[PDB]
Design a protein around this ligand. Structure first.
Ligand SMILES: [Ca+2]
Ligand SMILES: [Ca+2]
Ligand SMILES: [Ca+2]
Ligand code: NA
Ligand code: NA
Lengths: 151, 151
DNA sequence: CGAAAACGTCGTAC
DNA sequence: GACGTTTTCG
DNA sequence: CGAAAACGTCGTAC
DNA sequence: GACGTTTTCG
């Protein structure tokens, strides 16, 4: 899945505008470290324009559209295709380039982050950075909170 | 003032995201038909990212940035340069392409719209069209409104 | 007058 | 825009 | 368990 | 995002 340059240039600007590059630390006992690292690339749009989101699903060839009322979102969370997509988009972003680099870095690091409790906590630090870059306003689960892992 | 393709492709996506192509019929006795036709190309952005709007002023080479509190806007209203810019940006727009064409068409038509009251009113019809296409919500001055110029 | 700049603000669509 | 919590899936 | 899908909502930045 | 009203400028 290798994309067209004209498309990526256009999409990077659309993303810098209404997209979001999100990293979350999700709490849950089921997981080894009681938290799951989650990554999302998303594009939001008023539902009467949903066709646009649908066309993203067609060109990126992966991901899906969810509806949440008057608004919809194109969503891409699958680690492998997300990494493939972000890598190609990264060179054209201007406003969300750093968070794109951070997500790429987090993905490449997941394997060894399951291994030690200190590698996992470090990676969580990178998600704090992504949220600081974002216009974050209702964040709850922080790397700091994961640190109350101390027994 | 002929722009670089990569730059237009990217800006077209940003504009589809947080930009706005605007046509307004503005009331005022000073004008022959008691209304002034106004066109605006704008890009809005949070003031901590105003550098990004300043960078637009630099590349487009015309227009300016205005501050309105926690938010700012890159503004381009001069008919000649706006026509030039919209013509080159127009082919890459996907969501605001129609309003961009309508604005180009209104601009080309301004000279003859000062001539008859009927041509003027027809042009006002095109601005009703642009507002229909936009996510309009507080429009007051309509082509219908102008029609009560009837003596 | 004609045209742009300046200034101000409602209601979501991010 | 950018999170949150809850449910499915393998 | 691990990872994504599904579902839900706060607070602006358009 | 997409309008509004008021002031300047030529
Ligand atoms: Ca934006
Ligand atoms: Ca936006
Ligand atoms: Ca938008
Ligand atoms: Na921030
Ligand atoms: Na509309």
């Amino acid at each position: 899945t290798k994309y067209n340059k004209e498309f990526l240039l256009y999409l990077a600007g659309f993303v810098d505008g209404d997209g979001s590059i999100i990293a979350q630390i999700k709490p849950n006992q089921s997981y080894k470290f009681k938290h799951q690292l989650s990554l999302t690339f998303q594009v939001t749009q008023k539902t009467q324009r949903r066709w646009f989101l649908d066309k993203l699903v067609d060109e990126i060839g992966v991901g899906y559209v969810r509806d949440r009322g008057s608004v919809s979102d194109y969503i891409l969370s699958e680690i492998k295709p997300l990494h493939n997509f972000l890598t190609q988009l990264q060179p054209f972003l201007k406003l969300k380039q750093k968070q794109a680099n951070l997500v790429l870095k987090i993905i490449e690091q997941l394997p060894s982050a399951k291994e030690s409790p200190d590698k996992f906590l470090e990676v969580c630090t990178w998600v704090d950075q992504i949220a600081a870059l974002n216009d974050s306003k209702t964040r709850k689960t922080t790397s700091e909170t994961v640190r109350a892992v101390l027994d």
